[PDB]
Amino acid sequence: VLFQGPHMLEENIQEKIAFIFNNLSQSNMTQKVEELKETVKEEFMPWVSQYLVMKRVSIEPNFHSLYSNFLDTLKNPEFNKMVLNETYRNIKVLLTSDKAAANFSDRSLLKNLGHWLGMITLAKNKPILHTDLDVKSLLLEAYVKGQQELLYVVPFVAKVLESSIRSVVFRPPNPWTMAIMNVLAELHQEHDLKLNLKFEIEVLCKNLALDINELKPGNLLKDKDRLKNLDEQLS
């Protein structure tokens, strides 16, 4: 379904996969799950993964609970990792892309993918490995590159951390979750940071049932030695 070629029109595999996820509901879910297994070869699941993440998930955050339930009913761990790896691939296209304040779509895509990321990782009690994505280092990197990168990253990080509440492990006061919240707390009390991002962080705090003044900012934004030698995840 990515780069759909000439031979895939007659049978229209994308048009067939699309029939599964559109008009999907809690009512017809078990019917759609069995239909996916019945009408689509197991060899084609990578393409199904690509269609789900890219064509649906990235522009339908209202449907993420439904799609996450789809994965649950499907019970295909191999397909779940396809989706996860495909989720990381899409996140990186946006992270490594060239940023502007003028393009809103790319930021909404990045957020929705972040929200989805947390719903299939944190909320399912599975960690976001730093080999795939280093969240805390992402914030530190966004700080040195300027407001343009911060505008992309901060709401993105907020959307993935929102799922820690529905997690049994990643809820506060998880050392991993709180380590990130402390860096955001550090960014919050920076005269440089725009007001909307300061507001974004406060919204996130209450969304995690936290008092932003009970957080414990460190001195990571002043560690210029650590700031320069970051493994870059942005452009």
Author numbering: -9 to 0, 1093 to 1317
What does the study report here?
The interaction between NOT1 and CAF1/POP2 connects the NOT module to the catalytic module and thus is central to the assembly of the CCR4–NOT complex. Given the crucial role of this interaction, we have solved the crystal structures of the isolated CAF1-binding domain of human NOT1 (residues 1093–1317) at 2.90 Å resolution and its complex with CAF1 (i.e. CNOT7) at 2.70 Å resolution. The structures reveal that the CAF1-binding domain of NOT1 adopts an MIF4G fold; thus, this domain was termed the NOT1 MIF4G domain. CAF1 (i.e. CNOT7) and POP2 (i.e. CNOT8) are one-domain proteins that adopt an RNase D-like fold.
The structure of the isolated MIF4G domain of NOT1 was solved by molecular replacement using NOT1 coordinates from the NOT1–CAF1 complex as the search model. The crystallographic asymmetric unit contains six monomers that superimpose to the NOT1 chains in the complex with RMSDs of <0.7 Å, indicating that the NOT1 structure is not altered upon binding to CAF1. As predicted, the isolated MIF4G domain of NOT1 adopts a typical MIF4G fold composed of five HEAT-like antiparallel pairs of α-helices arranged into a right-handed solenoid. The HEAT-like repeats are followed by a C-terminal extension that wraps around α-helices α9 and α7 in a structurally conserved manner, independent of crystal contacts. Similarly the MIF4G domain of NOT1 does not undergo conformational changes upon binding to CAF1. A superposition of the NOT1 MIF4G domain with the third MIF4G domain of UPF2 yields an RMSD value of 2.8 Å, calculated from the positions of 190 alignable Cα atoms, despite a very low sequence identity (<8%). The most notable difference between the MIF4G domains of NOT1 and UPF2 is that the C-terminal extension of NOT1 is replaced by an additional helix (α-helix 11) in UPF2. Loop α3/α4 lies at the opposite side of the CAF1-binding site; the conservation of residues in this loop suggests that it may provide a binding site for an as-yet unidentified protein partner or other parts of NOT1.
